């Protein structure tokens, strides 16, 4: 019944992928060992869509952890929910890439893809009818950018008809955690633009900006940032996991948000975002959530939406709520701000609601936005790519693995192409 | 510097499936400049009637392209139409027959014949290639092992395919065996509308390179021979199973180039060639240094009267496009 | 006297579970599945002291179908009738029609045959759906085509939830509505339409419910669909059958798009203070803001209106009431059908759900009427379609299913023919 197979790549993709299984384990009432201790019967109604049943009323996640270094698996296996994962799925290499896309794509990737394609083949055969795949990686580095982008092409060859979702975190200019980031971002987007049908553009800079303004976290760690992005992955797959008044599968949101084949880079968001010291001084009905969703300082991307125009918007909701207040609020946001929405579409909002909200909250929603303001993050990395590429800097490492210099220029031709697409519809 | 796209129409006789049903002959010709359909003219360059033979079309449409592609520039000849419009009979035809042969053997026969008339100092290095598209995977015909290829960019960002078959030919008869080997392995499905239904785009590329020994001036010509498939209506054709799966793939390209050439009509900013891979290989045709000549095909039957109108408005929109030669 | 029903999409079964609970409480049918001639037209008699409805719930997505299997109304319905699929339509007219539709229609086709063969008083069919999504557009358009070639002569009463001018749940619904209407124009005998923001306005100003949900929207909609067939269930002084809605409301074989409105809609506290009679409801049903569609009836002209009352209502005041409606010059009837009034009566009154938002009323009316007021609505839907069709937006998914750009033009020119037909007929 539309089973989704999880897949991870890179260090960050294993961390946020690990946090993804943790947050959804709580609402489904899954123990860290694997047994069930929930209260509602609907949790078992669609537990098979991510997990696999087992003996003793145990449930195993349908996850495949892939990382070229072995130390990443030791941290995930030693976590709070590390033991629930299958030990056979922990496939990994020995010698890391060290932030090199050519290693994880050509040399170090070719020896491991044969070991992961047979594993996901087994998981794809275990389910009754698969819907698609969702992946977590990062454009920075070599593992998540190299290993993830490679098998995305292989999964397209093996599963060209199924949905191919991706949650890809991109770099930022002010927060730079890698010297070779624009080359990896420029080489990765050549594969993401053509292979996958959906993509969520996440930024680390906004993940720090979002925590100061509304959460008021004084000492935020990576685990706190993972809580925000993990909740976004749960909102997109809510209607098939629990019943709702209006269902919206991963395909039902893809057809509405992807108006063209190459324009599929979304922009996520989440609400209600409120600190613990100011929870009593706020309401929880629908209109305060609507204005917070479309707020510029709410999304986890560094793009200025006021500098562009939204192509389409999709706001999945959760929990019992009234439909009049939901529908009427989406009318005024597009009417009062008609300049910031394209006139060549009559309605840029996709609505959907569920009845079973997360634990600890009664009303919540997740934002999915495709907008022409995404190009400002793509040209700056392109400028960093072109600034470093024009003198052939940091290319001698990539040619040692047999990579051609023109492939960087072919990626450069793809880089200025996608930004020109959003400029056409602006 | 700037040349318009040569648009030409061709109506054919009614097939055996159409005359038995009793369709009305809606085709009405007004000279060669336009054709009338239900009191609605559509201006073109040259309209071919049902009585036009194979040799008459080649002399009128694809004759001048042999001189332009060999002069130093590029040239592209490809067709468009719905199902049962007569694209393969127009372009490929009966290869073994003298009269029924299409544009592919008539073109290559003119290259070797023209080379014999020119001087001996002009050294010609001709090389051919042939490949299909099948479930968005560029499968090669001369080699059965490889089922997919990747397109790369050259120095001036003109796209071209890598890893394809490259036979360095010397004799004209050798090309006749290559295209014959191509149709032998070409997949064909049986349907209610068409028996030999071309369910894939047959790209036949000839990188014609030439060089003079006296003046030392090297020149090349990109010669594209691409035969498009017909947009099959499932109610009329009855596509089911694997036929509908392949019918989906051909519908991508004709809709993709429809987005491109329509964007070129009003003169859009970006002109998104990249929306499909079939449109990527045709980048040089629509906006490169190629002397393009589209040849649309339409049936004179009233059963598909709406499809002919879609192809006619497709034709007149193509006349407003110009190539940057 | 029997009639088969079918529900499609998220919109279909969501009101289907809400309407059938209203049907069962009228005939004294407990939800467990048991308690002479009034219930035979919907509910069968299975052996001894057990019944089952003459309907089927079909939907590709399994979230709503299994909710009925795990819901409270489990023992009432057949376990086999709750048909479910394996792959969602996703706002695609083509995906629920060609790829996913073909591998599920064959269980659906033969089921209606055996369901009709056991029956003997089959009047017709009525389908509840919504063209505003994917499942209610493609699969609904496919099943009606395949049974029309088989049956043909039997009636077809469509019930679709169309989008509003400005409010909308989806974004691709013009493509979904424009494609499925191309097939609906030739095979649908009649199609009653309801707008999503209009029904919110019904419960806003009259029922004073500032925060309702879709469950409340289906209750008053269940009163509409149950009142049109109420004459067939119970006895009435002037009986009207299901085929009355085909001859009396369809002036031309292509113009088969009536409207719908219902009154009285009064809360519990307001019902005791507000007098209930035929005069106020007759003036209220023709009130423009009280209609279930955001289209001004003053702009158009009524071709014909079919009145149908319920409860203890004598036939004197209903004739005197419509006589006052004829004298009103604010409205305007078309010269092509001056006597466009069809009144009916049923002795059994409007029921009431325990704990429902609607209050008890001794009499009610369900007014269906055709007009050229929706001519601007089709022009509005066509106008917004031209904006996205000019940019070729959302086209790569439909052709990605198997279709092409050819029939996209066929649906456009079909609406162009449909638009001018409303303009020329309304002269
Ligand atoms: N929101 C979070 N971001 C993280 C976290 N860990 C890393 N990152 C960010 O993602 C950036 C790159 O992602 P990764 O840490 O996974 C580098 P990767 O493992 O793919 O390659 P190698 O470790 O060299 O084998 C990284 O520079 C951080 O900005 C995390 O736990 N949470
Ligand atoms: N008035 C009213 N409209 C409803 C109700 N339920 C659904 N709808 C409408 O139905 C439209 C979509 O109909 P469907 O085709 O059934 O949607 P779906 O079944 O979820 O289609 P998928 O997304 O592919 O699963 C929405 O835009 C809603 O506005 C309801 O209970 N009342
Ligand atoms: N100009 C013509 N004169 C006589 N017969 C023709 C002509 N063109 C096509 N035919 C007939 O059509 C048949 C071949 O059909 P063909 O393969 O061309 O269909 P098609 O147009 O390629 O279909 P699709 O558009 O779906 O690929 C031949 O048997 C031939 O007799």
- Gap between the Cα atoms of C142 and C105, Å rounded: 8
Ligand closest to C222 (CA) is: 2
**Residues of chain C with a following break (C to N over 2.5 Å):** 35
Q: How distant is the Cα of B298 from the closest Cα of chain A, in angstroms?
A: 29
- CA-proximal residue: ligand 2, atom 7 (nearest): C11
Beta strands in C277-422 (DSSP E): 302-306, 309-311, 341-342, 363-371
Query: Cβ of A421 under 8 Å from any chain B Cβ?
Result: yes
- Gap between the Cα atoms of A148 and A168, Å rounded: 10
| Nearest Cβ partner for B262 among C392, C401, C406 | C392
Within a 13 Å sphere around the CA of A411, how many CA atoms are in the beta-carbon half? 23
- Gap between the Cα atoms of B136 and B61, Å rounded: 31
Is the Cα dihedral B96, B97, B99, B102 positive or negative? negative
- Crossing angle for the helix pair A148-158 and A181-192, to the nearest 10 degrees: 10
C302-306 and C363-371 beta bridge pairing: antiparallel
Query: Which element (helix H / strand E) includes C22?
Result: helix C9-26
Contact B258 C392 (CB under 8 A): yes
Beta partners for C128? C7, C159
Structure tokens at C295: 């289209």
Q: Are A4 and A59 in contact (CB under 8 A)?
A: no
- Closest among A190, A67, A237, A182 to A136, alpha carbons compared: A67
Beta strands in B156-233 (DSSP E): 159-162, 167-168, 202-212, 218-227
- CA-proximal residue: ligand 3, atom 28 (nearest): B89
Q: Is the CB of C195 under 6 A from ligand 2?
A: no
Q: B173 — alpha (psi -120 to 50), left (phi > 0) or beta? A: alpha
Q: Are A384 and A182 in contact (CB under 8 A)?
A: yes
- Closest among B91, B3, B90 to B52, alpha carbons compared: B90
Contact B252 C400 (CB under 8 A): yes
- Gap between the Cα atoms of A56 and C250, Å rounded: 63
Best of C138, C171, C204, C211 to substitute, by most chain A Cβ atoms within 10 angstroms, is C171
Contacts of A57 (CB under 8 A, 6+ apart): A35, A36
SS3 call for B307: helix
Stated resolution in angstroms: 4.4
Contact C211 A322 (CB under 8 A): yes
- Gap between the Cα atoms of A204 and C135, Å rounded: 39
Q: How distant is the Cα of C107 from the closest Cα of chain B, in angstroms?
A: 18
SS3 call for C209: coil
Contacts of A82 (CB under 8 A, 6+ apart): A18, A76
Cβ burial, residue A279 (10 Å; 0-12/13-18/19+):
exposed
Q: How distant is the Cα of C204 from the closest Cα of chain A, in angstroms?
A: 9
Determine if the peptide bond prior to A396 is cis (ω within 30°).
Answer: no
- Closest among C39, C31, C54, C29 to C126, alpha carbons compared: C54
Best of C92, C402, C417 to substitute, by most chain B Cβ atoms within 10 angstroms, is C402
| Nearest Cβ partner for C88 among A249, A346, A349 | A249
- Alpha carbon of B49 to ligand 3 centroid (Å): 15
Judging contacts by C-beta atoms under 8 Å, the chain B residues touching residue C183 are none
Q: How distant is the Cα of A422 from the closest Cα of chain B, in angstroms?
A: 10
As annotated, the active-site residues of C are 244
Q: Which residue of A has its CA nearest to B147?
A: A157
Contacts of C107 (CB under 8 A, 6+ apart): C83
Q: Which strand ranges, in their side-by-side order, compose the sheet holding A199-203?
A: A3-8, A130-138, A163-170, A199-203, A265-266
Q: Are B304 and B88 in contact (CB under 8 A)?
A: no
Tell me phi and psi for residue A318, to 5 degrees: -140, 145
SS3 call for A21: helix
- Alpha carbon of A10 to ligand 1 centroid (Å): 7
- Gap between the Cα atoms of B169 and B127, Å rounded: 6
Residue with tokens 């127009």: B90
Best of A47, A128, A252 to substitute, by most chain C Cβ atoms within 10 angstroms, is A252
Contact B234 C102 (CB under 8 A): no
Q: What angle do CA C235, C238, C240 make, to 5 degrees?
A: 85
Q: Are B105 and B118 in contact (CB under 8 A)?
A: no
Tell me phi and psi for residue A260, to 5 degrees: -135, 160
Q: Which residue of C has its CA nearest to A197?
A: C397
Beta strands in C206-275 (DSSP E): 259-263
In order of A360, B74, B158, B325, C21, the CA distances from B286 in angstroms are 58, 12, 12, 10, 62
- Alpha carbon of A352 to ligand 2 centroid (Å): 10
In order of B179, B199, B230, the CA distances from B196 in angstroms are 16, 9, 12
- CA-proximal residue: ligand 3, atom 1 (nearest): B12
Structure tokens at A329: 């609020």
Q: Which residue of B has its CA nearest to A263?
A: B275
- Gap between the Cα atoms of A415 and A265, Å rounded: 13
Beta partners for A164? A133
- Gap between the Cα atoms of A244 and A238, Å rounded: 9
Q: Is the CB of C217 under 6 A from ligand 2?
A: yes
Contacts of B34 (CB under 8 A, 6+ apart): B41, B42, B43, B44, B47
- Gap between the Cα atoms of B29 and B81, Å rounded: 19
- Closest among B25, B1, B212, B32 to B124, alpha carbons compared: B212
- Alpha carbon of B200 to ligand 2 centroid (Å): 38
- Closest among C288, C75, C125, C320 to C202, alpha carbons compared: C288
Structure tokens at C317: 């005041």
Judging contacts by C-beta atoms under 8 Å, the chain C residues touching residue A2 are 86-88
- Gap between the Cα atoms of C372 and B233, Å rounded: 34
| Nearest Cβ partner for B275 among A262, A414, A420 | A262
Q: Which residue of B has its CA nearest to C414?
A: B306
Query: Which element (helix H / strand E) includes A311?
Result: strand A310-318
- Closest among A237, A39, A246, A52 to A131, alpha carbons compared: A237
Ligand closest to B199 (CA) is: 3
The experimental technique behind this entry is cryo-EM
What is the 8-class DSSP label of residue A147?
A: I
| Nearest Cβ partner for A344 among C87, C168, C387 | C387
Cβ burial, residue B113 (10 Å; 0-12/13-18/19+):
exposed
| Nearest Cβ partner for B135 among A160, A260, A406 | A160
Q: Which residue of B has its CA nearest to A407?
A: B152
Contact A325 C397 (CB under 8 A): no
| Nearest Cβ partner for C402 among B247, B258, B275 | B247
Is C101 among the annotated ligand-binding positions?
Answer: no
In order of A406, B136, B138, B161, B325, the CA distances from B150 in angstroms are 14, 11, 8, 6, 27
Contact B255 C404 (CB under 8 A): yes
Query: What is Dmax (Cα atoms) for chain C?
Result: 62
Contact B233 C407 (CB under 8 A): yes
SS3 call for C138: helix
- Alpha carbon of A172 to ligand 1 centroid (Å): 13
Query: Cβ of A322 under 8 Å from any chain B Cβ?
Result: no
CB pairs under 8 A between A and C: 118
- Own/partner contacts of A119-124, CB < 8 Å, gap of 24 or more, are A119/A64, A119/A88, A119/A89, A119/A91, A120/A5, A120/A7, A120/A64, A120/A155, A121/A158, A123/A5, A123/A62, A123/A64, A124/A5, A124/A159
Residues in chain A: 426
B150-153 and B159-162 beta bridge pairing: antiparallel
Q: A21 — alpha (psi -120 to 50), left (phi > 0) or beta? A: alpha
- Gap between the Cα atoms of C16 and C55, Å rounded: 10
A328: number of Cβ within 10 Å:
17
Q: Which residue of A has its CA nearest to C174?
A: A346
Is C63 among the annotated ligand-binding positions?
Answer: no
Query: Which residues 372-411 of chain C have a CB within 8 Å of chain B?
Result: 392, 395-396, 399-407, 409-410
Tell me phi and psi for residue B141, to 5 degrees: -100, -40
Q: Is the CB of B12 under 6 A from ligand 3?
A: yes
Within a 13 Å sphere around the CA of A381, how many CA atoms are in the beta-carbon half? 32
Q: Is the CB of C133 under 6 A from ligand 2?
A: yes
Within a 13 Å sphere around the CA of A254, how many CA atoms are in the beta-carbon half? 25
Residue with tokens 């001056």: C338
Best of A261, A407, A411, A426 to substitute, by most chain B Cβ atoms within 10 angstroms, is A261
- Gap between the Cα atoms of A386 and A392, Å rounded: 9
- Gap between the Cα atoms of A136 and A12, Å rounded: 8
- Gap between the Cα atoms of B202 and A137, Å rounded: 38
Is the Cα dihedral C271, C272, C278, C279 positive or negative? negative
Judging contacts by C-beta atoms under 8 Å, the chain B residues touching residue C406 are 82, 231, 233, 306-307, 310
A372: number of Cβ within 10 Å:
22
- Alpha carbon of A175 to ligand 1 centroid (Å): 12
SS3 call for C14: helix
- Gap between the Cα atoms of C385 and C396, Å rounded: 16
Judging contacts by C-beta atoms under 8 Å, the chain B residues touching residue C98 are 234, 244
- Closest among A225, A158, A230, A228 to A195, alpha carbons compared: A158
């Amino acid at each position: 019944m539309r089973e989704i197979v999880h897949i991870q790549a890179g260090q960050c993709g294993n961390q946020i992928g690990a946090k993804f299984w943790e947050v959804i384990s709580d609402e489904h009432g899954i123990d860290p060992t694997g047994s069930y201790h929930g209260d509602s019967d609907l949790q078992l109604e669609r537990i098979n869509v991510y997990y696999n049943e087992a003996a003793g009323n145990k449930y195993v996640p349908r996850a495949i952890l892939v990382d070229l270094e072995p130390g990443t698996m030791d941290s995930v296996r030693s976590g709070p929910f590390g033991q629930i994962f299958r030990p056979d799925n922990f496939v990994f290499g020995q010698s890391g890439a060290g932030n090199n896309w050519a290693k994880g794509h050509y040399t170090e990737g070719a020896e491991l893809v044969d070991s992961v394609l047979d594993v996901v083949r087994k998981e794809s055969e275990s389910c009754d009818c698969l819907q698609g795949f969702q992946l977590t990686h990062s454009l920075g580095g070599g593992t998540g950018s190299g290993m993830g982008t490679l098998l995305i092409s292989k999964i397209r060859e093996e599963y060209p008809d199924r949905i191919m979702n991706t949650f890809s975190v991109m770099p930022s200019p002010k927060v730079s955690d890698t010297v070779v980031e624009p080359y990896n971002a420029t080489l990765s987007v050549h594969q993401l633009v053509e292979n996958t049908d959906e993509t969520y553009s996440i930024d680390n800079e906004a993940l720090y900006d979002i925590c100061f303004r509304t959460l008021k976290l004084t000492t935020p760690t990576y685990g706190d940032l993972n809580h925000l992005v993990s909740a976004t992955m749960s909102g997109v797959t809510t209607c098939l996991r629990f019943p709702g008044q209006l269902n919206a599968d991963l395909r039902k949101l893809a057809v509405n948000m992807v108006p063209f084949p190459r324009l599929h880079f979304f922009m996520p968001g989440f609400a209600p975002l409120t600190s613990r010291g100011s929870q009593q001084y706020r309401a929880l009905t629908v209109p305060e959530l609507t204005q917070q969703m479309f707020d510029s300082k709410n999304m986890m991307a560094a793009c200025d939406p006021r500098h562009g125009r939204y192509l389409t918007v999709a706001a999945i909701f959760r929990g019992r709520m009234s439909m009049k207040e939901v529908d009427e609020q989406m009318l005024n946001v597009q009417n009062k701000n008609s300049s910031y929405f394209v006139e060549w579409i009559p309605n840029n909002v996709k609505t959907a609601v569920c009845d079973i909200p997360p634990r600890g909250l009664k009303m919540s929603a997740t934002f999915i936005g495709n907008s022409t303001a995404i190009q400002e993050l793509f040209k700056r990395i392109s400028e960093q790519f072109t600034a470093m590429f024009r003198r052939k800097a940091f290319l001698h490492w990539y040619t040692g693995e047999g990579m051609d210099e023109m492939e960087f220029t072919e990626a450069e031709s793809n880089m200025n192409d996608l930004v020109s697409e959003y400029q056409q519809y602006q | 510097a700037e040349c318009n796209i040569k648009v030409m129409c061709r109506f054919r006789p009614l097939n055996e499936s159409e005359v038995n049903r009793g369709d009305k002959y809606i085709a009405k010709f007004q000279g060669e400049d336009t054709v009338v359909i239900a009191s609605k003219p559509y201006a073109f360059d040259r309209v071919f009637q049902s009585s036009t033979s194979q040799e008459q079309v080649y002399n009128d449409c694809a004759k001048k392209i042999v001189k332009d592609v060999l002069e130093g520039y590029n040239g592209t000849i490809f067709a468009y139409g719905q199902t049962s419009s007569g694209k393969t009979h127009t372009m490929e035809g009966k290869l073994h027959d003298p009269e029924g042969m299409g544009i592919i053997p008539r073109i290559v026969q003119d290259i070797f014949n023209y080379i014999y008339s020119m001087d001996e100092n002009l050294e010609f290095h001709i090389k051919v290639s042939y490949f299909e598209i099948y479930l968005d995977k560029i499968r090669d015909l001369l080699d059965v092992s490889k089922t997919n290829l990747s397109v790369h960019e050259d120095k001036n960002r003109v796209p071209y395919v890598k890893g394809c078959t490259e036979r360095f030919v010397c004799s004209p008869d050798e090309v006749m065996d290559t295209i014959d080997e191509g149709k032998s392995n070409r997949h064909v499905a049986v349907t209610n509308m068409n028996e030999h239904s071309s369910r894939s785009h047959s790209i036949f590329l000839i990188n014609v390179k030439q060089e003079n020994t006296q003046t030392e001036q090297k020149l090349s010509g990109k010669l594209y021979l691409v035969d498009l498939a017909g947009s099959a209506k499932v109610s009329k054709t009855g596509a089911e199973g694997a036929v509908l799966d392949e019918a989906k793939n051909i519908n991508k390209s004709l809709s993709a180039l429809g987005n491109v050439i329509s964007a070129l009509a009003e003169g859009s900013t970006y002109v998104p060639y990249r929306d499909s891979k079939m449109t990527r290989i045709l980048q040089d045709s629509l906006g490169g240094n190629c002397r393009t000549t589209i040849v649309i095909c339409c049936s004179p039957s009233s059963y598909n009267e709406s499809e002919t109108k879609s192809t006619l408005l497709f034709g007149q929109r193509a006349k407003t496009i110009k190539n940057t030669v | 006297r029997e009639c088969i029903s079918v529900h499609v999409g998220q919109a279909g079964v969501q009101m289907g579970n809400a309407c059938w609970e209203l049907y069962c409480l009228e005939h004294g049918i407990q939800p467990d599945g048991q308690m002479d001639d009034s219930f035979t037209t919907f509910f069968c008699e299975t052996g001894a002291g057990k019944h089952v409805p003459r309907a089927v719930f079909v939907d590709l997505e399994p979230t709503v179908i299994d909710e009925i299997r795990n819901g409270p109304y489990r023992q009432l319905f057949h376990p086999e009738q709750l048909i479910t699929g394996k792959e969602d339509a996703a706002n695609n007219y083509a995906r629920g029609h060609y790829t996913i539709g073909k591998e599920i229609i064959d269980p659906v086709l033969d089921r209606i045959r055996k369901l009709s063969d056991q029956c003997t008083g089959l009047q017709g069919f009525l389908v509840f759906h919504s063209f505003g999504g994917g499942t209610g557009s493609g699969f609904t358009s496919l099943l009606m085509e395949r049974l029309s070639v088989d049956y043909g002569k039997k009636s077809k009463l469509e019930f679709s939830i169309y989008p509003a001018p400005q409010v909308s749940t989806a974004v691709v619904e013009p493509y979904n509505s424009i494609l499925t209407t191309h097939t609906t124009l030739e095979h649908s005998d009649c199609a009653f339409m309801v707008d999503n923001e209009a029904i919110y306005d019904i419960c806003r100003r009259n029922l004073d419910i500032e925060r309702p949900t879709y469950t409340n929207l289906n209750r008053l909609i269940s009163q509409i669909v149950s009142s049109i067939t109420a004459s067939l269930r119970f006895d009435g002084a002037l009986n009207v059958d299901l085929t009355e809605f085909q001859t009396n409301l369809v002036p031309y074989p292509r113009i088969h798009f009536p409207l719908a409105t219902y009154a009285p809609v009064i809360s519990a506290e307001k019902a005791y203070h507000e007098q209930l009679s035929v005069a106020e409801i007759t003036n209220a049903c023709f009130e423009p803001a009280n209609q279930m569609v955001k289209c001004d009836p003053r702009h158009g002209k009524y071709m014909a209106c079919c009145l149908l009352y319920r409860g203890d209502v004598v036939p004197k005041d209903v004739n005197a009431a419509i006589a006052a409606i004829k004298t009103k010059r604010s409205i305007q009837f078309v010269d092509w059908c001056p006597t466009g009034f069809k009144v009916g009566i049923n002795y059994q009154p409007p029921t009431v759900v325990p704990g429902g938002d609607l209050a008890k009323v001794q009499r009610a009316v369900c007014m269906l009427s055709n007009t050229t007021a929706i001519a601007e609505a089709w022009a509005r839907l066509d106008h917004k379609f031209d904006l996205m069709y000019a940019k070729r937006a959302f086209v790569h998914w439909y052709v990605g299913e198997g279709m092409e750009e050819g029939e996209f033009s066929e649906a456009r020119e079909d609406m162009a023919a449909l638009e001018k037909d409303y303009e020329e007929v309304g002269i």
